[PDB]
Amino acid sequence: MEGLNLVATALAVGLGAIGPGVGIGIIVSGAVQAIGRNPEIENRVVTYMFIGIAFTEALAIFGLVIAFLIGF
Amino acid sequence: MEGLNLVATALAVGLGAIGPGVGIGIIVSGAVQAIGRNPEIENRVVTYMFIGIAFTEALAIFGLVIAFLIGF
Amino acid sequence: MEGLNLVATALAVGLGAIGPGVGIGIIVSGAVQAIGRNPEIENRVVTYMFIGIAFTEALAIFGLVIAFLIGF
Amino acid sequence: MEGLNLVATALAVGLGAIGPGVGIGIIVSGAVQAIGRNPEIENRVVTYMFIGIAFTEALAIFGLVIAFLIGF
Amino acid sequence: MEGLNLVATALAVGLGAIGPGVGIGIIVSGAVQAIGRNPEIENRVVTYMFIGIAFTEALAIFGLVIAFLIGF
Amino acid sequence: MEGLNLVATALAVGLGAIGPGVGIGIIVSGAVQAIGRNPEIENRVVTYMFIGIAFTEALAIFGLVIAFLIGF
Amino acid sequence: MEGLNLVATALAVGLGAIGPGVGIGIIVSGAVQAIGRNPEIENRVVTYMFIGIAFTEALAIFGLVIAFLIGF
Amino acid sequence: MEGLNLVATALAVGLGAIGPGVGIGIIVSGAVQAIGRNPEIENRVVTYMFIGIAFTEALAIFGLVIAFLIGF
Amino acid sequence: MEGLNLVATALAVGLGAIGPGVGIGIIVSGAVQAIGRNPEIENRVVTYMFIGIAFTEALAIFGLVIAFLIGF
Amino acid sequence: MEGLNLVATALAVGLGAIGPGVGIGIIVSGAVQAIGRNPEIENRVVTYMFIGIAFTEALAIFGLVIAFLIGF
Amino acid sequence: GINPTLFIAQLINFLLLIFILRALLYRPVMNLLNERTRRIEESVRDAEKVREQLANARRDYEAEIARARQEAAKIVAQAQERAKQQEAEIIAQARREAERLKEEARAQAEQERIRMLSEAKSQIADLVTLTASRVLGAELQARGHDALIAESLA
Amino acid sequence: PTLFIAQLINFLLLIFILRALLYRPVMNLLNERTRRIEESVRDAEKVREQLANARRDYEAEIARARQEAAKIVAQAQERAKQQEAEIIAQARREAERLKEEARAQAEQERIRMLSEAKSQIADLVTLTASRVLGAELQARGHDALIAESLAA
Amino acid sequence: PTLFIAQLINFLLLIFILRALLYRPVMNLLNERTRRIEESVRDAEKVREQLANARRDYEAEIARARQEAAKIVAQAQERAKQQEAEIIAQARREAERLKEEARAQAEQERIRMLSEAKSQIADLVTLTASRVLGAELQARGHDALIAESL
Amino acid sequence: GINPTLFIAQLINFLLLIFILRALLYRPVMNLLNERTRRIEESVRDAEKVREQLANARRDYEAEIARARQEAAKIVAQAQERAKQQEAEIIAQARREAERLKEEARAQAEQERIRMLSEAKSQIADLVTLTASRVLGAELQARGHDALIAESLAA
Amino acid sequence: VGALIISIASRFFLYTGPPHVEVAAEVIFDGIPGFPITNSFVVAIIIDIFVIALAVAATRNLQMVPRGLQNVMEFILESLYNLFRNINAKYVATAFPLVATIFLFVLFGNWFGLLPGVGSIGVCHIHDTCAAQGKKLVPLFRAPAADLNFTFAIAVISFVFIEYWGFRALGPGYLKKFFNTNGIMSFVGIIEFISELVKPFALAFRLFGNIFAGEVLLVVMAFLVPLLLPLPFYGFEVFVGFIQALIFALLTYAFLNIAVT
Amino acid sequence: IASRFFLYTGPPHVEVAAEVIFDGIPGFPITNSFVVAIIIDIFVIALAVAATRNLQMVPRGLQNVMEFILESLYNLFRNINAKYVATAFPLVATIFLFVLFGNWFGLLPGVGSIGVCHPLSSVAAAEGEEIHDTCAAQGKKLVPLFRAPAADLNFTFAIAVISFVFIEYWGFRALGPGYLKKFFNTNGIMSFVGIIEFISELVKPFALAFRLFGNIFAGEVLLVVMAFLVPLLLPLPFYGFEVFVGFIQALIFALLTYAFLNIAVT
């Protein structure tokens, strides 16, 4: 119609938040269970969880940057 | 044709709450499940849980930013 | 378009129910599983679960805020 | 063009029922598993389960009332 | 815009089936798993399962209520 | 839009078969795992399982009914 | 705008192929787990697995039994 | 214009990828986990895993043929 | 309109990404857990895991094909 | 109406975010749990883990590529 | 519809259903049910009562037999266990009578002591004949002064 | 309407399926339940009859015990009277034997003391014989007796 | 511009918050690490020098042990000399006692010698008197003394 | 923005940065390798120096036991040497001195006995006294003469 | 019976026309100047007569060892007592007549809907019978669980019962719950309050929707083909009627149990 | 606490754009990113030479901090692959040290405030201020002289492509012609997964570049718009989150290049 760009930005930001949100949630839950079972393996478990967090959150970042390109 | 702005704000807020909501739910469920099986690690592991939340909330805040941006 | 404003309230409230509802279910199920596995940590567990509820309920509240704003 | 209020009510109720349904499914499955693991703590578990479940459908309740505010 | 009412009714019943269906799946899976782990607690826990069985359908049939208010 | 009735049928059939499908999947998986341990309870765990199916199938049929009220 | 009917066909087979589909996976997964833990019950479990599929595919058949009526 | 046929075939193929993709994911994960748990049974469950795939991809194939009757 | 083909390509690619993406995720998670449980069976399941991937990603490939047809 | 290319771009990137986000989350959670269970196979695990990501994230990138083919 | 007339009518019908079924299907049959449960409880108590009563019967049989034994042990006295004292007294009386007869026998010494009185015809004759037939060549040449000065120790 | 035939045929075939599938298990369950109730009431009645019979047996046993006690007391009384009479008879016999033996011994002692008196008289005879022989043997007799002994 | 003041105050506030929340842990960890490396260099170095001069302390202890040998040699020598003096002294006094006992035995046998001498001269007197009477009894013997007033 | 010239400029800037920091990261790698080698070789040589210090102690006890044994051996050697010396002394002087004392003693005995071999020391006075008086007589009476009696007295 | 069914095409011979049953309201059976007797009220009276007759047949003798229909009657009552004793300890005697009445009544209402003529027998005010004449056709013997006037009445009486037996159990404290906590149960208390408001509506609507879906599913599967296709749906609905009765009874009693504690 | 959220002094709007070309009067014009890249080059070289100029045992001060950071990163890389931890360290180390300061530069007052240009004034009854910028004159846009280096798709694409070429160089360094054997080997089903692995290998640098550029872009723009919402007392936690995420993202970029090196060489 007329204001479809607002709807596009909304859709992009929202779905980007939809996916990686559950991604980081699952990643942190798994890493926390792993550290809880074995505190001695933390020194690499934490780094692995952080790199996985970046991998998931990069998709929300892509969605938001596309939304900002569309809005701006 | 003209009411698209409200629909877009609604979609942005709603999906940015859809994702991180499940993310934090899974994060804290895993954190507390690890707490039950190992209490003395709590003062460590809980911090990581909050770190995870500090990402998922970000995504939600991400959506909130767009809602205000397109709202204003 | 005569509508597309009430639809905004509907969508925002419904999605803010979709996300945080699943979040609350997951978090309290995990907390109560920890309670069943570990009774005497309960109080600390309880506090943490409550915190998570708040840190999820906010997103749902955000959706309600949009209804308050769009609905006026 | 003219039936947008009907679509708004339908979306509000259905989207408010999508999340809390599986949320309380999770909540009671987890409570039941914890009951099976440790019946002695049952009562506390039961209370907390209800408290947890008392939050979740509240979101759906909000969605419900929204449809009424559109249905009326 | 004729036929909008039919789309609204279809959406309402579809989402009402979306949520509580997976809800009941999770409920019954958890209940039967706890029964398999320990049979003797079944007589106490099955009833509680039905409470959850009756807490998701309510939201679901709520949609049908709304569905009927556009269905008729 | 005279073609909206067919889209309504498609939504009612498809969106109504989302929750019940996963419901059957989770229910049968849980019942089978609970049969794997202590098969002597295999009859009892049948009952609730079929009961569970007889709820979610209803939901599916629920949506199916609306389809047959729209295309007809 | 007659081509909208094809879009209806798109959802009719489409959506109904994504609800049961994932569910079927869980069924088979659970079944295979039962073969891992105890092979002696295996045969009985197999029938039950098929029984579960006999529901989900039925739903999928429903998802198609309208589609051919929509798009021949 | 009548470009809805492209949207129709796109939706059909996308949903046929949506459902069966996660179905095969769960099936193969469960089969591999059970094979790793007990190796000597593997061949039997392998067939069963393929059997599950032989159903699940069928759904996707079903959607694909709809695209062949829409996309032409 | 003129952008309907673009919407078709976008929808096809997106949904064919969301199905096989979660499918591959679950496959690799289950396979890696099986490797951690026992490395001996490792290679004998790794191909199987790839075999599983060779199905799910194929669905995504189908979606990609549907994109590259529609745009060409 | 306005340009559908913006909505197409947004939908493509958003869905590419929602799928592989959960995929990578599950992959990393499974990998870190396997590491916590048995660190000796750890190196081998990460190898396969990255391969999984190298598939799953790739799908998301495909969606992003489509965005940069439509928005540009 | 939400017509209050049908609402009130159905509420009245259901209240009548409840207050009629709680006189014909809830109260009577369930009084019978918990009466049967009470009967089962009475029976399981009565089994223990039977065992206790049988133990009581054996105990009372033994106690009555023991009381009979005690009664008999008192009866052996008969108020005449002194019969042994009668035996002792009869023995003492016989001994006293025997002593009396022995004293009467020793009283024979009263006319034993009058036996020297025959010395006038016996002691003198044998005394003179002893000297007439001993020592002195069996000859009474010595007169011998006849009876001694003390005579026969007189 | 034409829905009538469909509704009756569907309901009839459903009822046939139920009676061919579900009728047997419910019949078996009802039979098992009524069997349980019948056996429970029969057991309760049997226990009540056992208690009544046991009370009757207890009364009969205590009656037999009292009868045996009376018999034992009567036997003890008769026996005690018997041995009392017998021991009195034995004491009388012993007294008669003792008195007869003592009287005979006293008679024999009187005879032996008469013999002792005769022996005492004889000893007295020797004593006075020696005493008179002392007389008239101092004036003479000392001679012609020592001479007689010398003659031998 | 108007955003400069807001940015400056936000940075100042966040810097203050970061200080008050994290400054003590970061210098705590840094101080712990530098004290780990500090002890592992300085204690190592002092032990290294106090064991590098131990190669000369070895010869110093050897000389000390030689001086131990010196006074044990001295004490063993003195022990030997005084023990020797004691044994030779008791040997000499035993010899003195032995010659004194020999002199005592000489006196005793001198007593025995005279005793035998007086016994021998005594019975020589007896024999001489016997022969004196038996050679010349003929003077006035066997008369006026045979009776001798019995 | 899409521009190849600025991208190439950034590439060249990062190449300069990676070379400069390659030098400035080549310095700490054998800073830390030198530190670690110092630490490990220093622990090894510290254990070695402890072992060599123990070797001094071991040689110390060896020298101590050896010196104690030769001291004991030499003191007993001197003890038995002087012991044999004084046994020789005691027996030798004892025997010779005792023999000398008994031989001078018997020589003195003969010197005391030689003097009685003379007429007046031959005890003639008591002889004539007991011959004259202790015979229950006055002098040479009864069985008494002068000439032959004196001759036998001379003996 | 073989799987090669030829009679699957019976719609050509027996066609029932459009699914004339969509009525979400009450249709009057008998014209009365006073209070109208709807289609659901006549069946409420009929099922009341049936229940009273069954009660009379069961408890006319009350003979000791249950046999025949007496055993059938006493079995379900014993099972319901066992279930409620499992749920709650001592309130079973207080609440049992109400919950057993709702169970029996709505079970027989649900199982009535299978009896043929529910959607076929009707009164005149592919073309049925009344449509031949000018008067419209309204069906007879509509299932009472379909009527809200009935399910809403059950909902309000259950709500009154639970509130009465929560108030009497917990004194005046239950009237205001524990709103004075202000630290934990201050924002929670209003949520439980609105939950107590919504639950009777949900309880009525569950029975409403389930039974309505049952009848319309039967009608539309008859419409598709009125032979051998709607048989699994008939069996499913006869199962779901008893299930609905039971779950309603167990939920009203469980709500009472959670109210008293 | 919540009594002084005065929005009367705040930015009028939000300026969101890609990298902006600096004035650059002579030829070869630099950008706003290519003056802060130079300033971060100078800063990191100054820090390295300050740690270098006095090297001795028991480090203290900035030299101790630099040594601790270097050894922590060394241990982080040694966990993945100990064979190349001492060989490929300079590249990952400078990537981390450079992107760290590039992301931490964005918070500085002046980033988005200083311009080269090649209460009453604020709008009432609105949450956002409307005080015009300095160069509202001549209609200039107030080009931000300081823009975060990692928020540009040129420097980011540069480091991504050098990472790509480094991985391929040192995977081809010791693997023989095994890359052609790893992809589309035509060995059963492994050909398909080899093709997809080749596609993924092709798209690694694009994924890394888009990820980091978008992360810094989103962080800085979030800071801008939420300072526009409320100038004070709102953005402290989000400023902390953004500085934290910039640091950790600078870390994850280096770990990703090293992990890609490991997976390519093994």
UniProtKB/Swiss-Prot annotation, chains A, B, C, D, E, F, G, H, I, J:
It comes from Chloroflexus aurantiacus (strain ATCC 29366 / DSM 635 / J-10-fl). The keyword Transmembrane helix applies. Keywords: ATP synthesis, Cell membrane, CF(0), Hydrogen ion transport, Ion transport, Lipid-binding, Membrane, Transmembrane, Transmembrane helix, Transport. F-type ATPases have 2 components, F(1) - the catalytic core - and F(0) - the membrane proton channel. F(1) has five subunits: alpha(3), beta(3), gamma(1), delta(1), epsilon(1). F(0) has four main subunits: a(1), b(1), b'(1) and c(10-14). The alpha and beta chains form an alternating ring which encloses part of the gamma chain. F(1) is attached to F(0) by a central stalk formed by the gamma and epsilon chains, while a peripheral stalk is formed by the delta, b and b' chains. It comes from the Bacteria. One of its GO terms (biological process) is proton motive force-driven ATP synthesis. This is ATP synthase subunit c. F(1)F(0) ATP synthase produces ATP from ADP in the presence of a proton or sodium gradient. F-type ATPases consist of two structural domains, F(1) containing the extramembraneous catalytic core and F(0) containing the membrane proton channel, linked together by a central stalk and a peripheral stalk. During catalysis, ATP synthesis in the catalytic domain of F(1) is coupled via a rotary mechanism of the central stalk subunits to proton translocation. Key component of the F(0) channel; it plays a direct role in translocation across the membrane. A homomeric c-ring of between 10-14 subunits forms the central stalk rotor element with the F(1) delta and epsilon subunits. It holds the Pfam family ATP-synt_C. It is found in: Cell membrane. One of its GO terms (molecular function) is proton-transporting ATP synthase activity, rotational mechanism. The record marks E57 as: Reversibly protonated during proton transport. GO terms for cellular component: plasma membrane; proton-transporting ATP synthase complex; proton-transporting two-sector ATPase complex, proton-transporting domain. It is a multi-pass membrane protein. Belongs to the ATPase C chain family. Signal peptide: none annotated. PROSITE patterns: ATPASE_C. The chain crosses the membrane at residues 7-27, 50-70. Its main location: membrane. InterPro entries: ATP_synth_csu_bac/chlpt, ATP_synth_F0_csu, ATP_synth_F0_csu_DDCD_BS, ATP_synth_F0_csu_sf, ATPase_proteolipid_c-like_dom, F/V-ATP_Csub_sf.
Swiss-Prot record, chain N:
Its main location: membrane. GO terms for cellular component: plasma membrane; proton-transporting ATP synthase complex. The chain crosses the membrane at residues 1-20. It comes from Chloroflexus aurantiacus (strain ATCC 29366 / DSM 635 / J-10-fl). InterPro entries: ATP_synth_B-like_membr_sf, ATP_synth_b/b'su_bac/chlpt, ATP_synth_F0_bsu_bac, ATP_synthase_B_chain. The gene is atpF. This is ATP synthase subunit b. Keywords: ATP synthesis, Cell membrane, CF(0), Hydrogen ion transport, Ion transport, Membrane, Transmembrane, Transmembrane helix, Transport. GO terms for molecular function: proton-transporting ATP synthase activity, rotational mechanism. It is found in: Cell membrane. The lineage of its organism: Bacteria, Bacillati, Chloroflexota, Chloroflexia, Chloroflexales. F(1)F(0) ATP synthase produces ATP from ADP in the presence of a proton or sodium gradient. F-type ATPases consist of two structural domains, F(1) containing the extramembraneous catalytic core and F(0) containing the membrane proton channel, linked together by a central stalk and a peripheral stalk. During catalysis, ATP synthesis in the catalytic domain of F(1) is coupled via a rotary mechanism of the central stalk subunits to proton translocation. NCBIfam families: ATP_synt_b, PRK14473.1. F-type ATPases have 2 components, F(1) - the catalytic core - and F(0) - the membrane proton channel. F(1) has five subunits: alpha(3), beta(3), gamma(1), delta(1), epsilon(1). F(0) has four main subunits: a(1), b(2) and c(10-14). The alpha and beta chains form an alternating ring which encloses part of the gamma chain. F(1) is attached to F(0) by a central stalk formed by the gamma and epsilon chains, while a peripheral stalk is formed by the delta and b chains. It is a single-pass membrane protein. SUPFAM superfamilies: F1F0 ATP synthase subunit B, membrane domain. Belongs to the ATPase B chain family. The keyword Cell membrane applies. HAMAP family: ATP_synth_b_bprime.
